[PDB]
Ligand binder design. Structure first.
Ligand SMILES: [Zn+2]
Ligand SMILES: [Zn+2]
Ligand SMILES: [Zn+2]
Ligand SMILES: [Zn+2]
Lengths: 222, 351, 290
């Protein structure tokens, strides 16, 4: 970004999600003037962010444990999904931290009976790596969202759908976020840049990872 | 603090003639536990109440009744100006339990063709009380909504505690684009008031249609009771009516004649349309410190009006809800009652 | 010898007068009416926090009556210890009781509820290295543990070990008092003597249960399948013993003939760790296993 910061003079940085607005001047090494955000002044509530730490068993839940199965958390997750599929109107989406999380959890969700129930209520439309199938899924999600039978679109927090696709009145009602998207599931490349993030900048491991994790967490909810 | 309306944008035409055809849901979702017995049973209680209300304020109209069971809609009372047929039909249904899915495409499809015989002067209408959250469509439903909106059959539906975009759309589509017709409850009384409000004619902004002059005549009661005899039931009725044109003994009914087929009415039905057509102006709540009128009511004599300076009690409000065209005070009771049963503004009548 | 009324002290505190006992000043403006002498707490229809009031009474005491108009109040020492182990603020419960309970909080009743909220164990059984030891968060606790034949004499001199406190917790003292205080790791043998001496000297110890100091090793041959019958009291009993997050074994008084072992198999599987099952007699062991 330095050359365009070297080249261009009057630039604006704007998003629905930018948080914190200071991590960017730190990493990108640039000067700002009005790092100003605005609150939502409403005459009504209009949305519900909730922290489901616990399940019915009052059990703390996560995808940080593994990218795997632990029938307690999985069935707890299966219980939360099936009841959300019962309550939200047409248009509901969720965001796994990782696709390999999605693939493992979903496969053995069809193993139990959790998938048949949501199949009674709504349509279920998976996110496939080939996006023609994903596109064929997404539009049929929106079409079913604008149609009667509920449409459920399940994707990856780091996947393609979160980048540009919007969820309107009907195309999105209750977003969910199963665990927090993290990447040290994979190898040490983040560690290396994070090390650089640690040595070149005064940015720790967890503060960087939680910032990115909540950067895409914020990216999905809006 | 007041919860009163600003302005009515439709006293001009009401749909005085009607063919309203109410359809129910006897599906599994009616067996869930939100409404006191369930959805299924307490819904039916208020429908009975509406049935009585719908024919009292629109007695010239008819209705049919359809249930929604097992992905199959099932007519249970034919489109009739006789409520008791529907009332008795409703009495049997609650004794059966709701089941299966609501297949709206079924229910819409039979509703649309049921109203074809309903003429141009009579108004086609459908009232869906939807309470489940999924459907099962035998065909294209947009085909049917497109077919429905084509047949001049407006649709207002009352969803349960949820909002569904298709019936958002359906009420939007049929009702001339003017989506005002997927109003939904949170509450039994909200449901109760959801039922009572569906009785009056439904004008929003009427398009110019053929205003057709309607030829009828009026029946007259029979006297001889030992001559108990009927041409509309072929039984021993101790005295009925006689159509002005057919000349056949017809039992007491606003029902059409069964021998020459002209609508039989005495006088009473149209005057409900009058106060339907041209209602009054709302009784204005007079300002507390600017009223200075008689310390009583007008339609009744309600000496309670204030307490004359009580710091909080007097600075609140002066119970003087007064109509405008008469400029006569009315206690809220009268002001409510005047606006409740007899439109007939007491001050505006006497001048 | 070794008998405690406090566990079985339930069944009293229902006796008042009319001359000495006055109508509760909250009686005019109080949703409930805490009859302190009679120990009865009638939760009428006028209580807005009746659900909140109903739960608090069930913890500290036992609601004898649950009538449609008003409920009934009974005193239970195990409830008092259980309501003391409930964790509700002893003062906070009394005032919402006092404000809600139109009958003024009885002086004896008020003392017991506060005695519930704080007592029912003020013991100081310290723990080291995520285990149980002879120590105390309070000082009279370290004195009880150190001067204990089983707690102290059975306690190894080591202050705490991650593995020893992990493993040994002079048995398993996964029921100890507040840990992360001064204590010494206890051996792998004999908490009977630990409890048999806190028995003889009447040490009501404010105890916990550290359920992943239910760690205990590489994972056993446990098939973590929930195919065993699940029906609703067991799960919320489990939800009570599963508590927050992870499996705590509590005391869960269960009937033989209504799927009693079913909670145990789940909690055994959930910990994914070595577990033994003990039934009454060996012949019943086979019957139960059959
Ligand atoms: Zn007849
Ligand atoms: Zn005739
Ligand atoms: Zn009056
Ligand atoms: Zn007037």
């Amino acid at each position: 970004i330095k050359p365009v910061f070297e080249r261009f003079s009057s630039v604006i940085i704007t998003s629905g999600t930018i948080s914190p607005l200071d991590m960017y001047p730190r990493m990108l090494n640039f000067k700002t003037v009005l790092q100003k955000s605005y609150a939502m002044t409403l005459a009504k509530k209009s949305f519900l962010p909730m922290i489901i730490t616990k399940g019915s068993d009052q059990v703390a839940i996560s995808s940080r444990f593994e990218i795997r199965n632990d029938p307690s958390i999985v069935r707890n997750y299966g219980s939360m999904l099936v009841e959300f599929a019962k309550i939200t109107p047409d248009g509901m989406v969720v965001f796994f931290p990782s696709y390999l999380y999605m693939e493992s959890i979903v496969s053995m969700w069809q193993t139990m009976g959790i998938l048949d129930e949501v199949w009674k209520h709504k349509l279920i439309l998976v996110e496939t790596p080939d996006a023609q199938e994903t596109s064929l899924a997404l539009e049929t999600y929106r079409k079913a969202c604008s149609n009667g039978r509920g449409a459920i679109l399940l994707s990856v927090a780091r996947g393609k759908v979160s980048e540009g696709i919007d969820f309107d009145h009907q195309y999105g009602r209750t977003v969910l976020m199963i665990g927090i998207p993290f990447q040290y599931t994979e190898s040490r490349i983040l560690k290396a840049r994070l090390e650089f993030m640690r040595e070149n900048y005064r940015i720790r491991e967890n503060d960087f990872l939680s910032f990115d994790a909540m950067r895409h967490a914020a990216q999905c909810l809006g | 603090k007041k919860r009163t309306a600003k302005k009515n944008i439709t006293p001009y035409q009401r749909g005085i003639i009607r063919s309203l055809i109410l359809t129910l849901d006897c599906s599994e979702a009616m067996l869930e536990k939100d409404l006191r017995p369930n959805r299924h049973a307490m819904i039916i209680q208020y429908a009975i109440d509406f049935v009585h209300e719908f024919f009292d304020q629109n007695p010239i109209s008819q209705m049919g009744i359809i249930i929604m069971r097992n992905g199959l809609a099932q007519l249970v009372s034919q489109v009739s100006g006789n409520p008791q047929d529907h009332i008795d039909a409703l009495k049997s249904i609650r004794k059966q339990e709701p089941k299966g899915n609501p297949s709206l495409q079924n229910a819409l499809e039979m509703a649309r063709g049921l109203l074809l015989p309903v003429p141009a002067h009579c108004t086609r209408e459908v009232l869906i009380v939807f309470g489940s959250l999924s459907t099962t469509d035998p065909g294209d439903i947009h085909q049917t909504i497109d077919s429905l909106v084509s047949e001049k059959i407006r649709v207002k539906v009352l969803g349960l505690s949820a909002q569904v975009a298709i019936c958002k759309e359906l009420c939007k589509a049929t009702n001339y684009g003017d989506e005002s017709f997927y109003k939904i409850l949170l509450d039994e009384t909200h449901l109760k008031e959801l039922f009572n409000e569906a009785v009056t004619p439904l004008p929003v902004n009427k398009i110019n249609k053929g205003f057709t002059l309607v030829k009828m005549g009026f029946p007259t009661r029979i006297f001889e009771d030992t001559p108990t005899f009927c041409s509309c039931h072929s039984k021993l009725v101790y005295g009925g009516y006689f159509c002005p044109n057919c000349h056949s003994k017809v039992c007491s009914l606003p029902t059409v004649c069964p021998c020459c087929d002209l609508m039989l009415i005495l006088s009473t039905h149209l005057a409900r349309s009058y106060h339907h057509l041209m209602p009054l102006k709302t009784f204005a709540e007079v300002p507390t410190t600017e009223k200075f009128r008689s310390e009583d009511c007008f339609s009744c004599q309600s000496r309670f009006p204030x307490x004359x300076x009580x710091x909080x009690x007097x600075x609140x409000x002066x119970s003087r809800y007064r109509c405008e065209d008469c400029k006569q005070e009315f206690c809220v009771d009268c002001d409510v009652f005047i606006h409740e049963i007899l439109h007939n503004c007491p001050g505006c009548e006497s001048k | 010898p070794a008998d405690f009324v406090p566990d079985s002290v339930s069944g009293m505190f229902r006796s008042h007068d009319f001359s000495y006992l006055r109508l509760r000043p909250d009686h005019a403006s109080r949703p409930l009416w805490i009859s302190p002498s009679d120990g009865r707490i009638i939760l009428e229809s006028f209580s807005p926090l009746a659900e909140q009031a109903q739960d608090f009474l069930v913890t500290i005491a036992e609601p004898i009556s649950r009538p449609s108009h008003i409920h009934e109040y009974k005193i239970t020492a195990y409830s008092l210890y259980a309501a003391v182990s409930v964790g509700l603020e002893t003062d906070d419960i009394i005032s919402v009781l006092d404000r809600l309970s139109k009958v003024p909080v009885a002086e004896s009743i008020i003392n017991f509820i506060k005695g519930a909220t704080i007592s029912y164990g003020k013991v100081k059984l310290v723990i080291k290295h995520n285990r149980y030891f002879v120590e105390t968060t309070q000082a009279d606790i370290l004195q009880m543990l150190l001067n204990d034949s089983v707690i102290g004499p059975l306690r190894i001199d080591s202050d705490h070990q991650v593995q020893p406190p992990e493993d040994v917790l002079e048995r398993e003292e996964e029921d100890d008092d507040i840990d992360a205080v001064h204590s010494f790791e206890i051996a792998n043998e004999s908490v009977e003597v630990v409890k048999k001496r806190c028995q003889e000297i009447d040490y009501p110890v404010l105890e916990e249960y550290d359920f992943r100091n239910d760690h205990r090793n590489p994972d056993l041959d446990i098939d973590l399948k929930p195919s065993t019958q699940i029906r609703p009291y067991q799960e919320k009993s489990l939800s009570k013993m599963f508590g927050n997050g992870r499996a705590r074994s509590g005391i869960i008084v269960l009937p033989c003939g209504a799927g009693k072992t079913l909670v145990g198999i789940t909690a055994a599987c959930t910990i994914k760790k070595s577990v033994i099952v003990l039934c009454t007699s060996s012949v019943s062991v086979m019957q139960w296993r059959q």
